[PDB]
Amino acid sequence: KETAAAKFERQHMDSSTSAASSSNYCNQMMKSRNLTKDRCKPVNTFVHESLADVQAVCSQKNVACKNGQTNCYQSYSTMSITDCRETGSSKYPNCAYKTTQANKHIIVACEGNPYVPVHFDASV
Numbered sequence: 462k463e464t465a466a467a468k469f470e471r472q473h474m475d476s477s478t479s480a481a482s483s484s485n486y487c488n489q490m491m492k493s494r495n496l497t498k499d500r501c502k503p504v505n506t507f508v509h510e511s512l513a514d515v516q517a518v519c520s521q522k523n524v525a526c527k528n529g530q531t532n533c534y535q536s537y538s539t540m541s542i543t544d545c546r547e548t549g550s551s552k553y554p555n556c557a558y559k560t561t562q563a564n565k566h567i568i569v570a571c572e573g574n575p576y577v578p579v580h581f582d583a584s585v
């Protein structure tokens with residue numbers, strides 16, 4: 462089945478655009494990446510950098526994840542991201558999102574060999 466590394470790329474990577482270019486960004490990208498198939502996912506961040514630069518995070522600053530695990534890493538640089546989160550109008554299967562574009566450090570958790578990101582923890 463899909464691996465956790467492919468799942469993080471599908472859920473979180475958008476190196477095709479530099480930033481969200483309209484208020485409809487998250488509605489179109491949450492539907493097209495299949496993240497509203499079973500239920501509206503309520504929050505989801507996309508990162509607008511190359512895949513190499515996000516895989517490099519797993520060699521930068523180790524930090525504790527929100528839930529206490531110690532395989533999270535925080536980016537040294539800020540990155541261009543879009544935060545999508547559900548709005549009061551959202552109702553399955555017509556999931557609805559507000560798009561917020563921002564430049565933040567990312568914190569991801571890494572696993573495997575090669576050791577790559579498999580979960581988006583937070584933006585700070």
Ligand SMILES: Nc1nc2c(ncn2[C@@H]2O[C@H](COP(=O)(O)O)[C@@H](O)[C@H]2O)c(=O)[nH]1
Pocket residue numbers: 504505506507527581582583584
């Ligand atoms: N699992 C996951 N959490 C995220 C993502 N983007 C942001 N978050 C987290 O979701 C939080 C906001 O969710 P909440 O505060 O409503 O449960 C932020 O504090 C951050 O920790 C994402 O793509 N996946």
